[PDB]
């Protein structure tokens, strides 16, 4: 029964004098609900889930203001980072930021996080204890010093410990129908003779939620982790997820292979065999 | 709910 809320911010500079693009999106679990895009027409925190629309005029100002303040600080960061790494004003550069909170089966604080990247790699990160900083290079250290002096850790802490958890709850309660649902995988198995010798067996998990899951083939006892083609779990586009795992086998030996499906949403881990 | 504090320049 664990839940989280995470925000994700990306800022990308443009060659020359052009304004940076800003994108923010927010998630409760595997469900996104807000977004902001500098490129888009509104100029506001726009809702992305139905149940967040219950929020009133003021709510939308607050998050609009707060997202613009987030953007103004990303805009400036890029300038500073372009300096700390003495990089020409020519190339594109990316700042990403992520923060959020987790509560457990009982809606009390579990953990919080705040992480910052520059150019696709760690730059500065709030530690688990939420009190101090890991700095990934002497430029991050300049920041680390600046952030200590302004008590940034205690500030985000308070946020992560306070309002972050309290809002997570309100969302859990007001998007009840979406957010606290468990969807077990709808499963099936496909078989295709791929030569005289061998066949493909493909085990599918469809329309599951949350996204976490394990599909693993076994032959007889010990398992096939190596000879398996597995895709990474993927959004269906309707708020659920798909995954599959395949294995190639000798024709007439398919009864020897078994697919294991684990998911919070199944009381017992399903096992599947090609049973045509 | 975006934090209103804790975000300042690097």
């Amino acid at each position: 029964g664990s839940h989280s809320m995470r925000y994700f911010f990306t800022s990308v500079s443009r060659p020359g004098r052009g304004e940076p693009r800003f994108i923010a999106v927010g998630y409760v679990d595997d469900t996104q609900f807000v977004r902001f895009d500098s490129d888009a027409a509104s100029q506001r925190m726009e809702p992305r889930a139905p149940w967040i629309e219950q929020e009133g005029p003021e709510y939308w100002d607050g998050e609009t203001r707060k997202v613009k303040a987030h953007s103004q600080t990303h805009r400036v960061d890029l300038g500073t980072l372009r300096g700390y790494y003495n990089q020409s004003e020519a190339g594109s550069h990316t700042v990403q930021r992520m923060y959020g909170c987790d509560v457990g089966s009982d809606w009390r604080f579990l953990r919080g996080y705040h992480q910052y990247a520059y150019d696709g790699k760690d730059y500065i990160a709030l530690k688990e204890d939420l009190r101090s900083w890991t700095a990934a290079d002497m430029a991050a250290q300049t920041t680390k010093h600046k952030w200590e002096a302004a008590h940034v850790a205690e500030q985000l802490r308070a946020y992560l410990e306070g309002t972050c958890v309290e809002w997570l709850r309100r969302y859990l309660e007001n998007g009840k129908e979406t957010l606290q649902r468990t969807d077990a995988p709808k499963t099936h198995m496909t078989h295709h003779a791929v030569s005289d010798h061998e066949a493909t067996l493909r085990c599918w998990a469809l329309s599951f939620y949350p996204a976490e899951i394990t599909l693993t083939w076994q032959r007889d006892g010990e398992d096939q982790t190596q000879d398996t083609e597995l895709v990474e779990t993927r959004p269906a586009g309707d708020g659920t997820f798909q995954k599959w795992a395949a294995v190639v086998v000798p024709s007439g030996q398919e009864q020897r292979y078994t697919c294991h499906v684990q998911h919070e949403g199944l009381p017992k881990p399903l096992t599947l065999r090609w049973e045509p | 709910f975006l934090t209103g504090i804790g975000i300042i320049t690097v």
Binding site: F8, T10, V12, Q96, A117, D119, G120, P235, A236 | -
Partner: protein, 100 residues
């Protein structure tokens, strides 16, 4: 300056029964940087009305998006997702297989 080529999945929202309305999806992920170009194709030509999710990213900082449009699978019709990114020399086409 990390770069990563997109991983690309092209599949349908609901299991494909042909002649029935469905959603053709293109999931591009594990990429860096953000600038990316994705065309959903029908017989090697661009499908008109394509929509996409909001740029987000994973714990490894690599990005992901999902493109989708409505389509109706047939026997004859070839769908595909075509992707471009600084990491690629020429676009990558990934044809759609109803059982992938």
């Amino acid at each position: 300056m990390i770069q990563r080529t997109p991983k690309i999945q092209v599949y349908s929202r609901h299991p494909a029964e042909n002649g029935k309305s469905n959603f053709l999806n293109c999931y591009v992920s594990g990429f860096h940087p953000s600038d990316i170009e994705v065309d959903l194709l029908k017989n090697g030509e661009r499908i008109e009305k394509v929509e996409h999710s909001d740029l987000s990213f994973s714990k490894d900082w690599s990005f992901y998006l999902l493109y989708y449009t409505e389509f109706t699978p047939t026997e004859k019709d070839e769908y595909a997702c075509r992707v471009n990114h600084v990491t690629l020399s020429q676009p990558k086409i990934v044809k759609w297989d109803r059982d992938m």
